[PDB]
Design an enzyme around this catalytic site. Structure first.
Site, short mmCIF file in Angstrom:
data_model
loop_
_atom_site.label_atom_id
_atom_site.label_comp_id
_atom_site.label_asym_id
_atom_site.label_seq_id
_atom_site.Cartn_x
_atom_site.Cartn_y
_atom_site.Cartn_z
N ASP A 182 41.26 32.49 34.35
CA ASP A 182 40.71 31.89 35.34
C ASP A 182 41.15 31.07 37.08
OD1 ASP A 182 38.08 33.89 36.98
OD2 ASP A 182 37.48 32.02 37.46
N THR A 232 40.12 36.15 42.24
CA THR A 232 39.96 34.82 42.79
C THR A 232 41.39 34.18 42.43
OG1 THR A 232 39.39 33.88 40.59
CG2 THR A 232 37.62 34.09 41.67
N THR A 233 42.67 34.52 42.39
CA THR A 233 44.24 34.50 42.09
C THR A 233 44.69 34.81 43.69
OG1 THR A 233 43.90 33.61 39.37
CG2 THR A 233 45.58 33.57 40.77
N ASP A 257 34.31 37.79 33.61
CA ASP A 257 34.76 38.39 35.03
C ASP A 257 34.56 39.70 34.97
OD1 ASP A 257 35.39 36.19 35.37
OD2 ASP A 257 37.90 36.47 35.54
N1 LIG Z 1 47.41 46.72 32.70
C1 LIG Z 1 47.71 46.60 34.09
N2 LIG Z 1 48.68 47.34 34.81
C2 LIG Z 1 49.87 46.29 36.45
N3 LIG Z 1 49.34 45.65 36.43
C3 LIG Z 1 46.94 45.22 36.05
C4 LIG Z 1 47.30 45.28 34.52
N4 LIG Z 1 46.16 45.25 35.00
C5 LIG Z 1 46.07 44.18 35.95
N5 LIG Z 1 47.11 44.63 37.31
C6 LIG Z 1 46.92 43.85 38.04
O1 LIG Z 1 47.51 42.56 37.81
C7 LIG Z 1 46.84 41.71 39.29
C8 LIG Z 1 46.57 40.60 38.59
O2 LIG Z 1 44.50 40.48 38.77
P1 LIG Z 1 44.31 38.97 37.55
O3 LIG Z 1 45.26 37.75 38.39
O4 LIG Z 1 44.14 38.80 35.86
O5 LIG Z 1 43.29 39.24 38.47
P2 LIG Z 1 42.19 37.44 38.60
O6 LIG Z 1 43.25 37.35 40.70
O7 LIG Z 1 41.16 37.66 38.97
O8 LIG Z 1 42.63 36.42 37.82
C9 LIG Z 1 45.88 42.87 39.70
O9 LIG Z 1 45.47 42.99 41.00
C10 LIG Z 1 45.86 43.94 39.36
O10 LIG Z 1 46.17 44.89 39.98
#
Ligand SMILES: Nc1ncnc2c1ncn2[C@@H]1O[C@H](COP(=O)(O)OP(=O)(O)O)[C@@H](O)[C@H]1O
Ligand SMILES: Nc1ncnc2c1ncn2[C@@H]1O[C@H](COP(=O)(O)OP(=O)(O)O)[C@@H](O)[C@H]1O
Ligand SMILES: Nc1ncnc2c1ncn2[C@@H]1O[C@H](COP(=O)(O)OP(=O)(O)O)[C@@H](O)[C@H]1O
Ligand SMILES: [Mg+2]
Ligand SMILES: [Mg+2]
Ligand SMILES: [Mg+2]
Ligand SMILES: [Mg+2]
Ligand SMILES: [Mg+2]
Lengths: 117, 532, 528, 155, 526, 98
Positions: free
Chosen positions: B54, B87-88, B391
């Protein structure tokens, strides 16, 4: 300077039976989690040479920014190999030290729970 | 000449320092974005170890000195507080926006024009997202929630076990569902008590159809299992009575001391008798219970738990139908305890979980409640599962509240970039550069995903942009708006069909917050740092 | 990473690897380019650097500024090295090369951050540089007539363009004409040591003069020197390398006599040796005597008796210039002082110039050397004037070698950028982005010109791009008119080889910087 | 406005470019112009009191305690122990005037100080310093031509 | 005056170095206790910082005393602690397995494979491992005491207590069976609370036994107390038997002459009334966790009642379980049910130079005391740890009657099954799957290495043997270094222990693979 | 292969992808690495190219020898096998000339 005035914080001045007193201090820390036992070298503080040469064991206790206890050179009145319980009793005789177990952890908006329609 | 006791930076120097600080904060967390992202380890000065993905937690734990870095960290914290996800991405987008705006400023473009262009681009991006890239969840069903939870739990320690964790999350959120005035279905997350306990594998994590307490019975003589539980929730300690400060005991006739001392404890004894006389079986109190009252509960064959957390007690009272009583005082100046203030549960048991015990109030009536017991290999793993689970719960809550979702995997970013670079040519003369830079900055998300996947970022993003340009130009190719990134194979893929969703509120709030943070930093062109 | 009791490298070794170190190298290159960024163009400004000893150096030259900067960054040193290379091979463009290299690196930084393989960028740079050099050679304007007046005008215009950025730019026509005149009198090799440059404190710039001969400062005259005449109307000059004073015949020589008659004979023999050398010089017919080795007081008085001018301890380069101007030969022996080994000038005179005495050899009709006598209010003033004249002299020499000129003011770079963008629009697309980035980076110089002049860079850039796109090759930045103009018709001329070398060096530096993936710093030994 | 530029990279890695960069100082653009103009103004104002028949002397004491009383501007500035570079430039200007002419070593300092003082208020109004220098050169040429015009010859 | 983004004492490292360092830390932690596995393991001496000496070969005991700085080692220590707490056995096995899987993961990470693929392959492998372990399990009859004794023997044959196998097995089995409890439809064992292990240095270990009751280091308050009661009626108390101040401030004011004596006499009478209320139940022994006044002792002796004071709460709960009594805080509310009848003998005797109180003839007691007598304190501590392991294994078997072959037979069987399964994967993750499957061969490998036999020949022979049809119970004889069918050697392990070890090792590998960046030096920021 | 920026104890710049030069300008302290470096230098002296091949092959051989030692082989067996395989490779090599 920091931390609450209502918590007793003691520091130890040492140079490299220091090991036995350090072990007793670790045992007390394990027995008194609310306290914040810590130690620091004299050379870091740069104290006087007399303190370094004749006052190696220092039991300095701070309570709210003032010295409620300045036990220095505790070799004579405590010993060399006394255990942690002896130190605990000696410190508690003067009324300085403070008087279940979860699985691992429980802690984690203000809306707790509302079933109102 | 100034005679100011401090250092001063003006012009390009301070702007470059601010942009460098923001870029450093971005690069700190750029490696934990998307399913191919990897976690980080944070070690304190006392040896405490934290493993997390996170962004908000990482930025909170770090020590930050530069004010712009502080701005970005608090931006991540605000995004976590108001949404819970992304949040990232918000931090990365804000840093990229600041970098591009600073480059424009170095090109002798006035910062006010760049700020106006950024505002226009943010407004148009929000409008385009709300008008074209949203997907209604009414016709998708529970699969939409399952896919949203799985997407939210990607890039987390519980990613591969998503097939089970998403079911758990959806069941818990639907269990804690309630309706309020004006008929709005509200989902009060943080009512799901997340309990951690190391031991057996993740797949043995249990979703409790009731509530879980991280506390045990006060005495070893009480039974540890009651079938028909009549829960009594109290907010006062059950111990020897003591007079208040204004009341003093002065004895002139010595024959009354024994009666005084007897009454002292008989008051609490009669209070316990009144409580037990109504048939109560489980007694929970926020205060403490001494030995004699524990024995009183033991003799009646009833549970008694002390030092119960106030929030846990409130949740138990709400779920079981009980009411918390801070005192046993009625409206006629007497002590009483009616049966109406008794909650009911199908079963209350003290279960053992890895050499430790906790109380499970199972299947409460008049209201459904849920709790999750997480089993991991060690403490750090359990903490990371708890964070990822929170989350996912927040994402499911956002999806259920607002019934619009958008495709993931950078599809929204690419579509927005294409639309904004086409739209910038329509308004203004110097703001068009700002809108173009906003569109370019929006492309940092798919580029970061591809970089994390160790794929050809340039070619993949070029293909994505070509697909979205074809979708926007050809009016019969609207089906290409969902073309996201398949990180496993490194190819474009219809993410809406593949089941990669995320709440629209996440993207909207991220865009708004990042734009405001970039605007706030961009106004700065002079720094005065007084010596302490 | 583990302590590993036995370690591989020496303790304290610092290693940086991956994309972040390349990004840091690019940032360091930008930092270096920023330190000389504002010194480019007629509106450029000078920089003052103080060393540890307290000496201050004021210079508009990019190479000098970079040299005075004590860079220690391994990637940043490449920009200083290529600036030195440009100064050595060309003499002008030292500010342009660093800006071009830094702009190349800045343009390719976003592609580096997203994981692009460096070899692709290197190949794109090589291809773009080859195409740009070919285009420069193709479109450079040359005149195949060998007309003296127009070739002289071309030299003067190139000199003025190379000079219109320094503190002597107000008198750029005057100094340009002086420089062209000085260069045209060099014989075949255009050796820089053949153009003397003397700096005299005091006096305005317009008081500086070019001598059609040789001039040097007075060198520690002995007693009886003021009794010598200080003007001749057709002197013959005896260029010698001889010590004319009483001294031991040899360092290891020893005289052994046992009679007072032999003692007197020995002292008379020493005096007769000295007087025989002086007598040979006198009957050589010369009126001016110059020598590398000291000329004693006895010889000074002897020459004063015969109404001759003498000057000992003359520097070697000054005697070489005097020999090449008057047309004599430096003699180590005075036994055969023939007529052909004697220099000759129309007028010799000693005159005072700002509190100093200078010897003048004017009227030489077949001189192959020169002498710049620069005036100014401070030693740094003369130093910067000398640096600017050196730049102009190098430009004029290169123009003499090949009279291939291109219009300045960024017009050539607009043409190159347009051509490169047109080429990049006809390739698959992976190299298209990099070649387009190269073309965009080629716009740094006119943008920097506008920024230094206080213009609005974006509007001038847009106007130049539109003008070049629809037709027009030599349209660049016009500083005075707040607008753009045809720089070729404005006589803003540059030798094509200057820009060719600039592009080649910048491309080589960018490729070398990009090709480095890891930096290793061994701990310093003998820190002292 | 000092200590150069300190970045230490955006990846946390060391960022060292110039040796002893933490112990060096730097002034950019208009602030440097203001500092130089102020230094020249101070030097010129110190010198201007010793101008004319009623000008007063300066009592100069060297490092060895030897004291010299003089009115010559070049002599005063030569013995003055300055550390600002612009002050050294002004001293060199006075010495150059002494070497070329021998008189008027004080007038040059005052004239330069006044010119820079006026250039300060021109700079405050947003004029490029190169434009100020070009205007000063044009006016100097005009003044020199006027001096030649109004000059008179003596036997 | 430096400008910074992070603190000047914050250090960050990332990339291949972090993964290599974490995996090397796990490998070194495994190497610490690599030689402490199997029947032929060797002791290790640990010097406690408080001056004590820990001499043992238990994996968790060894790892718990080690202070490490690399956080991956801390994670491994937490893994060992979790394995010890969950099942009580397999700490060395789980540590070694985690180290081996992380070594294989490092091998795969040296190439261009992303850690997520390795993690997915590891999780699929773990699912198949669990399936195979459940498949090759065999049932156990609870009522068969001989089989339980054999299981406990196979559990403790690798410890120092193996010299006395029958004695330790009987002690552990008896303690676990008698502490077993059932109330309100809820089954519990509660080895942690009851079944206390009391160690008295001296004597011989053959004299050690488990009592049908409880034993505490306490003496009668007064010498006139009876030190030997045939069929006592124990009454337990939680409150003091002495006059105590009230909670409220209760200042008195005396103006008459006799009020002082009256107050003292009423204190006397209050103590007498409390003693009479206790006596009305006609007990023989009174036990309380707090003090007993001298007047209370006199009034109890007047009724021929033995009183012991200042016992610990845990000891009093153990006595309540053993003798079937109820702890009562208010003597005026004592009931006949609260009186503890069921203890067949109470006796205070002298051991060495101390008095010990024995209640050692209880009929159907739910608590017990294990009296350990040995050479010294460290030997008794090791014996107590071994007994704890035996009791944990007995509880695991009682809860889950599934049984699994030991001596590496299960490891090789699961490895062969997973290798056969991997032949149809036809993907990119088949290589990590097969490699982590073969990583299970470290347990037979380290067993052979500790035995001192030829590792390569024995492993090759075992792998060839496991390729046959009915050879899932073929392990390695850890004391002779020979291949033997394990259904005749008798070495078997509970399925729960193997499952926990496998799951914990796989998830440790996954958790340490999920990491590629480390930041340190920042304050905890409370 | 990418070039490497190497700074020696005298702060002399070195950009090169030549393995021998990089090894020479690195303060190698581990003596086994010293043997590998001097073997590379001997290869450079005898032929002039292939130093990076020498390091890569030696490193691969040593890691695989470590694996063989872990699985249970003795040092003598590994050495004998490596010598036999090297002899076989030297015999094979003339047949691979194109
Ligand atoms: N299975 C998937 N295939 C392709 N893209 C994905 C998948 N799961 C999540 N993502 C993308 O990865 C990006 C990063 O998400 P993440 O960094 O894990 O959330 P956060 O920003 O809350 O930490 C998200 O914008 C999402 O659109
Ligand atoms: N009269 C002019 N008008 C516009 N630009 C000019 C003029 N004279 C020179 N330039 C520009 O100034 C640049 C040279 O600046 P300068 O600092 O003197 O040398 P360098 O080439 O080392 O930067 C050339 O690129 C040229 O285009
Ligand atoms: N007699 C035996 N012969 C061969 N292997 C045995 C024998 N007894 C036990 N083992 C094996 O040794 C292992 C026990 O090792 P141990 O030292 O108890 O490790 P841990 O303390 O981690 O459980 C078990 O997996 C079992 O299969
Ligand atoms: Mg997320
Ligand atoms: Mg130039
Ligand atoms: Mg005068
Ligand atoms: Mg074991
Ligand atoms: Mg080679």
């Amino acid at each position: 300077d920091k931390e609450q005035k209502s918590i007793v914080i003691m520091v130890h001045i040492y140079e490299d039976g220091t090991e036995a007193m350090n072990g007793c201090m670790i045992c007390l820390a394990a027995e008194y989690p609310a306290v914040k036992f810590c130690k620091v070298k004299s050379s870091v503080i740069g104290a006087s040479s007399q303190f370094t040469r004749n006052a190696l064991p220092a039991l300095l206790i701070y309570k709210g920014g003032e010295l409620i206890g300045n036990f220095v050179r505790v070799t004579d009145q405590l010993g060399d190999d006394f255990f942690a319980v002896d130190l605990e009793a000696f410190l508690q005789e003067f009324g300085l030290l403070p008087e279940v177990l979860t699985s691992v952890r429980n802690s984690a908006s203000e809306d707790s729970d509302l079933e109102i329609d | 000449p100034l005679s100011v006791f401090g250092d001063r930076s003006t012009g390009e120097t301070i702007r470059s320092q601010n942009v460098m600080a923001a870029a450093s904060i971005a690069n700190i967390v750029k490696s934990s974005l998307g399913p191919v992202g990897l976690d980080k380890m944070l070690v304190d000065d006392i040896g405490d170890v934290t493993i997390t993905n996170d962004g908000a937690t990482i930025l909170k734990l770090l020590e930050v000195e530069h004010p712009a870095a502080k701005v970005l960290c608090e931006l991540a914290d605000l995004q976590d507080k108001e949404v819970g996800d992304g949040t990232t991405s918000v931090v990365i987008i804000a840093a990229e926006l600041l970098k591009n705006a600073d480059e424009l400023v170095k090109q002798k473009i006035h910062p006010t024009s760049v700020i106006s262009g950024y505002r226009l681009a943010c407004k148009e991006a929000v409008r385009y997202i709300n008008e074209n890239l949203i997907v209604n969840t009414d016709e998708l069903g529970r699969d939409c929630l399952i896919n949203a939870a799985k997407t939210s739990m990607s890039s987390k320690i519980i990613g591969i076990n998503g097939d089970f964790f998403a079911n758990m999350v959806v069941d818990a959120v639907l269990a804690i569902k309630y309706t309020d005035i004006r008929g709005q279905p509200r989902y009060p997350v943080n009512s799901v008590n997340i309990l951690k306990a190391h031991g057996r594998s993740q797949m043995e994590s249990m979703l409790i159809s009731g509530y879980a307490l991280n506390c045990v019975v006060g005495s070893q003589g009480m039974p540890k299992r009651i079938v028909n539980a009549k829960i009594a929730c109290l907010d006062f300690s059950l111990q020897k009575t003591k007079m208040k400060l204004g009341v003093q005991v002065v004895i002139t006739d010595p024959e009354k001391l024994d009666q005084i001392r007897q009454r002292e404890s008989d008051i609490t004894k009669e209070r316990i008798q009144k409580i037990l006389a109504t048939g109560a079986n489980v007694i929970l109190t926020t205060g403490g219970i001494d030995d004699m009252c524990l024995k009183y509960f033991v003799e009646a064959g009833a549970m008694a738990v002390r030092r119960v957390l106030k929030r846990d007690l409130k949740r138990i009272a709400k779920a079981s139908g009980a009411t918390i009583l801070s005192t046993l005082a009625n409206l006629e100046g007497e002590e009483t305890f009616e049966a109406a203030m008794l909650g009911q549960a199908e079963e209350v048991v003290q279960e053992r979980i890895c050499d430790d015990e906790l109380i499970l109030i199972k299947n409460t009536k008049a209201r459904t409640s849920a709790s999750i017991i997480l089993r991991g290999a060690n403490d750090f793993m359990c903490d990371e599962m708890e964070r990822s689970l929170h989350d996912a719960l927040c994402v499911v809550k956002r999806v259920l509240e607002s019934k619009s979702v958008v495709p993931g995997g950078g599809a929204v970013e690419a579509a927005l970039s294409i639309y904004l670079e086409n739209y910038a040519t329509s308004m203004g003369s110097r703001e068009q550069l700002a809108i173009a830079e906003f569109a370019r900055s929006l492309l940092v998300i798919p580029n970061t995903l591809a970089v994390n996947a160790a794929q050809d970022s340039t070619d993949l993003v070029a293909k994505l942009r070509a697909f979205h340009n074809e979708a926007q130009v050809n009016p019969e190719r609207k089906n290409l708006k969902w073309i996201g990134l398949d990180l496993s194979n490194g190819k474009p893929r219809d993410n809406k069909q593949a089941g990669v969703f995320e709440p629209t509120i996440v993207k909207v709030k991220s865009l708004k917050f990042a734009t405001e943070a970039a605007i706030t930093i961009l106004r700065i062109d002079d720094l005065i740092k007084l010596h302490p | 990473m583990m302590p590993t009791p036995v370690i591989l490298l020496k303790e304290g070794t610092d290693s940086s690897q991956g994309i972040p170190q390349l990004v840091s190298n690019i940032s360091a290159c930008q930092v270096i380019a920023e330190a000389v960024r504002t010194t480019l163009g007629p509106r450029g400004m000078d920089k003052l650097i103080v060393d540890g000893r307290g000496k201050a150096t004021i210079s508009n030259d990019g190479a000098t500024i970079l040299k005075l900067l004590d860079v220690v960054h391994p990637a940043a040193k490449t920009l200083v090295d290529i600036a030195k290379s440009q100064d050595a091979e060309v003499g002008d463009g030292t500010t342009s090369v660093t800006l071009l290299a830094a702009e190349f690196l800045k343009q390719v930084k976003p592609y580096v951050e997203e994981g692009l393989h460096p070899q692709i960028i290197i190949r794109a740079f090589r291809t773009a540089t080859q195409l740009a050099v070919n285009k420069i050679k193709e479109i450079a304007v040359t005149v195949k007539k060998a007309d003296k007046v127009e070739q002289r005008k071309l030299l003067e215009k190139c000199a003025m363009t190379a000079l219109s950025s320094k503190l002597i730019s107000q008198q750029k026509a005057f100094f340009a004409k002086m420089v062209v005149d000085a260069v045209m009198m060099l014989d075949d090799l255009l050796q820089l040591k053949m153009i003397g440059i003397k700096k005299v404190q005091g006096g305005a710039l317009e008081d500086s003069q070019l001598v059609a001969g040789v001039a040097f400062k007075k060198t520690f005259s002995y007693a009886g020197f003021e009794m010598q005449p200080k003007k001749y109307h057709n002197p013959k000059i005896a260029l010698l390398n001889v010590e004319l004073e009483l001294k031991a015949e040899k360092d290891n020589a020893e005289i052994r006599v046992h009679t007072v008659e032999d003692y007197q004979a020995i002292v008379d023999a020493e005096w007769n040796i000295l007087y025989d050398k002086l007598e040979k010089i006198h009957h050589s017919g010369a009126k001016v005597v110059l020598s590398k080795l000291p000329i004693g007081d006895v010889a000074t008085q002897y020459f004063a008796d015969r109404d001759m001018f003498c000057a000992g301890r003359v520097p070697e380069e000054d005697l070489k210039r005097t020999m090449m101007a008057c047309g004599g030969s430096i003699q180590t022996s005075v036994n055969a002082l023939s007529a052909d080994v004697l220099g000759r000038c129309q007028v010799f005179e000693e005159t005072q110039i700002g509190g100093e005495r200078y010897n003048f050899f004017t009227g030489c009709p077949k001189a192959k050397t020169c002498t710049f006598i620069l005036r100014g209010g401070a030693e740094q003033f003369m130093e910067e004037t000398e640096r600017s004249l050196h730049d102009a002299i190098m430009i004029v020499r290169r123009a003499i070698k090949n009279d291939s000129v291109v219009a300045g003011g960024g017009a050539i770079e607009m043409e190159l950028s347009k051509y490169l963008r047109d080429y990049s629009r006809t390739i698959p697309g992976k190299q298209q982005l990099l070649i387009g980035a190269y073309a965009k980076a080629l716009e740094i110089i006119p943008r920097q010109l506008c920024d230094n002049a206080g213009f609005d860079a974006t509007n001038i850039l847009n106007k130049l791009r539109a003008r070049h796109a629809q037709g027009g090759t030599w349209y660049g930045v016009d500083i005075n008119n707040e607008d753009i103009a045809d720089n070729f018709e404005a006589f803003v001329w540059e030798p094509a080889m200057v820009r060719i070398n600039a592009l080649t060096a910048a491309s080589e530096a960018a490729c070398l910087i990009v090709s480095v993936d890891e930096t290793i710093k061994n701990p310093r030994s003998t820190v002292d | 406005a000092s200590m150069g530029t300190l970045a230490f990279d955006e990846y946390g890695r060391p960022f060292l470019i110039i040796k002893d960069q933490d112990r060096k100082s730097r002034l950019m653009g208009l602030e440097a112009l203001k500092s130089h103009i102020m230094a020249a103004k101070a030097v010129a104002n110190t010198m201007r009191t010793s101008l004319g028949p009623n000008g007063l002397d300066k009592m100069m004491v060297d490092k060895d305690g030897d004291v010299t009383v003089t009115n010559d501007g070049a002599t005063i500035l030569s013995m003055m122990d300055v550390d600002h570079q612009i002050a050294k430039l002004m001293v060199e200007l006075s010495k150059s005037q002494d070497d070329e002419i021998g008189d008027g070593t004080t007038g040059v300092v005052v004239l330069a100080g006044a010119l820079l003082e006026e250039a300060e208020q021109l700079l405050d109004r947003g004029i490029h310093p190169i434009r100020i220098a070009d205007g000063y050169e044009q006016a100097a040429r005009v003044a020199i031509e006027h001096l030649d015009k109004i000059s008179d010859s003596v036997l | 005056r430096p400008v910074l983004v992070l603190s000047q004492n914050t250090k960050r490292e990332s990339g291949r170095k972090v993964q290599s360092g974490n995996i090397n830390a796990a490998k070194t932690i495994a190497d610490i206790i690599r030689t402490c596995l199997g029947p032929k393991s060797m002791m290790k001496m640990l010097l406690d910082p408080m001056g004590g000496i820990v001499m043992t070969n238990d994996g968790n005991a060894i790892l718990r005393e080690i202070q490490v700085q690399h956080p991956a080692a801390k994670s491994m220590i937490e893994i060992s602690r979790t394995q010890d707490e969950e099942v009580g056995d397999g700490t060395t096995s789980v540590i070694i397995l985690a180290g081996e899987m992380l070594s294989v993961a490092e091998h795969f990470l040296e190439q261009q494979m992303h850690p997520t693929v390795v993690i997915s392959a590891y999780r699929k492998a773990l699912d198949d491992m669990i399936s195979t372990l459940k498949k090759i399990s065999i049932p156990v009859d609870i009522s068969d005491s001989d089989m339980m004794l054999n299981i406990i023997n196979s559990s403790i044959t690798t410890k120092a207590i193996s010299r006395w196998s029958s004695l330790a097995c009987n002690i552990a089995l008896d303690a676990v069976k008698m502490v077993q409890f059932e109330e309100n439809g809820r089954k519990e064992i509660d080895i942690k609370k009851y079944a206390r292990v009391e160690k008295i240095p001296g004597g011989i270990i053959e004299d050690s036994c488990v009592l049908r009751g409880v034993m505490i280091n306490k003496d009668v308050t007064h010498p006139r107390m009876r030190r030997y009661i045939k069929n006592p009626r124990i009454v337990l108390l939680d409150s003091s038997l002495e006059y105590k101040k009230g909670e409220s401030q209760t200042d008195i004011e005396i103006t008459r002459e006799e009020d002082f004596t009256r107050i003292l006499q009423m204190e006397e009478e209050y103590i007498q009334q409390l003693c009479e209320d206790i006596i009305q139940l006609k007990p023989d022994v009174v036990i309380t966790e707090k003090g007993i006044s001298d007047l209370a002792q006199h009034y109890l002796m007047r009724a021929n009642i033995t009183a012991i004071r200042r016992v610990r709460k845990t000891d009093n709960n153990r006595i309540a379980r053993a003798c079937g009594a109820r702890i009562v805080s208010r003597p005026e509310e004592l009931r006949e049910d609260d009186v503890g009848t069921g203890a067949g003998l109470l006796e205070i005797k002298k051991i060495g130079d101390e008095y010990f109180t024995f209640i050692t003839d209880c009929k159907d007691p739910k608590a017990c005391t294990i009296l350990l007598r040995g050479a010294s304190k460290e030997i008794l501590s090791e014996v107590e740890r071994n007994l704890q392991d035996a009791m944990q294994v007995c509880r695991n078997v009682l809860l889950d009657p599934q049984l699994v072959p030991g001596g590496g037979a299960s490891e090789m069987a699961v490895a062969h099954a997973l290798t056969e399964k991997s032949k149809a994967m036809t993907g990119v993750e088949q290589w990590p799957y097969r490699a982590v499957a073969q990583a299970l061969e470290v347990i037979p490998r380290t067993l052979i290495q500790n035995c001192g036999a030829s590792t390569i020949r024995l492993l090759t022979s075992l792998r060839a043997k496991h390729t046959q049809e009915n050879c899932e119970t073929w392990g390695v004889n850890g004391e002779t270094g020979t291949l033997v069918d394990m259904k005749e050697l008798g070495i078997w392990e509970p399925l729960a222990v193997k499952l926990q070890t496998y799951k914990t090792a796989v998830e440790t590998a996954v958790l340490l693979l999920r990491i590629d960046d480390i930041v340190s030096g920042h304050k905890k920021k409370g | 292969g990418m070039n490497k920026m190497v700074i020696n104890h005298l702060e002399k710049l070195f950009v090169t992808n030549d393995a021998a030069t990089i090894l020479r300008e690195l303060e190698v302290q581990h003596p086994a690495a010293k043997m590998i470096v001097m073997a590379s230098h001997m290869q450079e002296q005898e032929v002039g190219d292939g130093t990076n091949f020498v390091l890569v092959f030696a490193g691969a051989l040593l890691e695989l020898a470590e694996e063989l030692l872990r699985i249970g082989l003795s040092v003598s067996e590994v050495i004998e096998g490596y010598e036999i395989a090297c002899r076989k490779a030297h015999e094979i090599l003339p047949n691979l000339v194109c």
